[PDB]
């Protein structure tokens, strides 16, 4: 026989993947990249031929690693900031709005707060949102005052999703399925290796994959199994959809003192007209994108059937709406107007109500809550939509019509939209072979 060292062998395996980020602006240890090693300046992407690998993006263990990594990174970046345990206090809170429905959704709460000297106490006021406080029996109090410990994200750090590359260690290679028509499971005609992935923006969103990867020039409807309604249907666009997300309210930040050495940033008076955030999407471009996605959906359910879009069925606010961040605070757009079309066989912009929510318990870890600080001035951001986390409603005895509704909730689907075409394989450069050679005695 004969063994060879360095034989082109890979096997499906799981391992810890480190990172690599661009050197391009520290901003006091940005959430995404603080200790991440510099990326490879020249990403050698090596192509392969006569190569066939059994890809499976739903049994992929990379997505679990990135989800746990994001959880740990969020907790770590949130740990040293200001604790907000003294905010649990009776809030003498009143309405702000004179005219009926000029804007709830803006609560002026005056309460007590211990100052630098424990002997003295100060009377302060703040502008909370309705979704952030609940009434106790008017007297209000923070919504997450009885289930967790509120912790303010220290505003020195930002919430910017920075492109991140997860690069496997030595002896582990990352396979890229470079073929165009990729379903999600099965052999990949064009398998190519690389040191590690493209720039991944770890955005947090539901029902719309903001700033995702849109390299898929086709609307490939993905899911671990089409026939299962209860499993979310992953959709990835080809043409980006522009969105104009704005927070027209001009908030001023008041640094209420919870010293020694602790600051509670409360919203001051809204200098300007009281308004509510609106998330605009061009009606046309959204129409044709829905047309493309329904044309591709008809390939998974019959030849010609009624496809109906409806608003989210129900659940938590972070699921019934569109959770995301725009410029430093979390808020939700019910997108009830983007899913209302019913299609059987075949200039303006749609506007969506958007509700601010400073206090956030994202990822549903009851052990820790969070308080997003107010951002001074008008917040404006433009994102591009590359995918839909749709869920199929249950059918019937004769399902001539199939209704698709938005879903999400589980963030793993958000991450799978960027790691569908990647997987890690360990190298086994040891391998026997039959030869005619013969070692001497």
């Amino acid at each position, epitope marked *: 026989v004969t063994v060879y060292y360095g034989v082109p062998v890979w096997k499906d395996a799981e391992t810890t993947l480190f990172c690599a980020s661009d050197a391009k602006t520290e901003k006091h240890n940005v959430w995404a990249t603080h200790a991440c090693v510099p990326t490879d300046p020249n990403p050698q992407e090596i192509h392969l031929e006569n190569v066939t690998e059994e890809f499976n993006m739903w049994k992929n263990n990379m997505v679990e690693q990135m989800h746990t990594d994001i959880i740990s990174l969020w907790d770590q970046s949130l740990k040293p900031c200001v604790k907000l345990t003294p905010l649990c206090v009776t809030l003498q809170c009143t309405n702000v709005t004179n005219n009926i429905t000029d804007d709830g959704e803006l609560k002026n709460c005056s309460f007590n707060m211990t100052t630098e000297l424990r002997d003295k106490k100060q009377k302060v006021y703040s502008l909370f949102y309705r979704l952030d406080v609940v009434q106790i029996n008017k007297e209000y109090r923070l919504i997450n005052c009885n289930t967790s410990a509120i912790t303010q994200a220290c505003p020195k750090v930002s919430f910017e999703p920075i492109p991140i590359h997860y690069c496997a260690p030595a002896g582990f290679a990352i396979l890229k399925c470079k073929d165009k028509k990729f379903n999600g499971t099965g052999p990949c005609p064009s398998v190519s290796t690389v040191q590690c992935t493209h720039g991944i923006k770890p955005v947090v969103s539901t029902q719309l994959l903001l700033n995702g990867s849109l390299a898929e020039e086709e609307v490939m409807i993905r899911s671990e199994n089409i026939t299962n309604n209860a499993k979310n249907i992953l959709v990835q666009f080809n043409t980006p959809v522009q969105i104009n997300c704005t927070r027209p309210n001009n908030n001023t930040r008041k640094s209420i003192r919870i010293g020694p050495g602790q600051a509670f940033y409360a919203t001051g008076d809204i200098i300007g007209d009281i308004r509510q955030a609106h998330c605009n999407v061009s009606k046309a471009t959204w129409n044709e994108t829905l047309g493309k996605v329904v044309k591709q959906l008809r390939k998974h359910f019959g030849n010609n059937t009624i496809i109906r879009f409806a608003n989210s069925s129900g659940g938590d606010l972070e699921v019934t709406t569109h959770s995301f961040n725009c410029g430093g605070e979390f808020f939700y757009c019910n997108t009830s107007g983007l899913f209302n079309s019913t299609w059987i066989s075949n200039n303006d912009s749609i506007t969506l109500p958007c509700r601010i929510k400073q206090i956030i318990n994202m990822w549903q870890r009851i052990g820790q809550a969070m308080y997003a600080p107010p951002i001074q001035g008008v917040i404006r951001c433009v994102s591009n939509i590359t995918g839909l986390i749709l869920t199929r409603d249950g*059918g019937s005895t004769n399902s001539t019509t199939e209704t698709f509704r938005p879903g999400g909730g589980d963030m793993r689907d958000n991450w799978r939209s960027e790691l569908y075409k990647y997987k890690v394989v360990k190298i086994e450069p040891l391998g026997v072979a039959p030869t005619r050679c013969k070692r001497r005695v």
Partner: antibody
Amino acid sequence: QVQLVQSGAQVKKPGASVTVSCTASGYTFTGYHMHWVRQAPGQGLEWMGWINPFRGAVKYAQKFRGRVSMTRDTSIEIFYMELSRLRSDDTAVYYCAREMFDSSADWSPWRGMVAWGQGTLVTVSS
Amino acid sequence: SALTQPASVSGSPGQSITISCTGSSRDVGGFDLVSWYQQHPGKAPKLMIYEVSKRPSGVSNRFSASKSGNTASLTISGLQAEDEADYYCYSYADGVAFGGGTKLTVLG
């Protein structure tokens, strides 16, 4: 242990709204789907919907969309089933059925729902 | 109901019978999630068997069930007194559907 204690029997007038609680105990609350099953006395078995406790994802039945509304409170570890626009045929006993496997299983929300509650009988009579 | 069930089956204890849960080509033969239930009179239903050609724990071996193509079947062995209840066939096809019900009589 697994016990799904529900609320007591309620009497309602057609056209009103009825809500029922179904508390869970003795298992991880945010990992198992919860099927809600309605049974009119003497006839077959039907279905309300299943709640994913993580983030509160729900999925109703075609013939109950627009009437049923299901929520939950993770902190107190109980389930809510609110039904509105009551009809004379809605007089029945309602069952909340905890599933067998974790929510991450292959066919988790469509499994056998081994655990069942005691059941609340609601009387909707003119 | 999408599932059709026999009204009732009668007999003595000791022998073996079959409960045919026939359905459609999209429910029993389409998938492999057919299950069977046991509901005592006035008591919430219990899971008497896991799935077709599959037995769970907490139940005796006496419940042997499978699917014969379009006709799922539940065969109960060692007929005894405690089996006296109503059995509901449970299949899987999109929105959950339940069988009308299979009554049975033992030693009576």
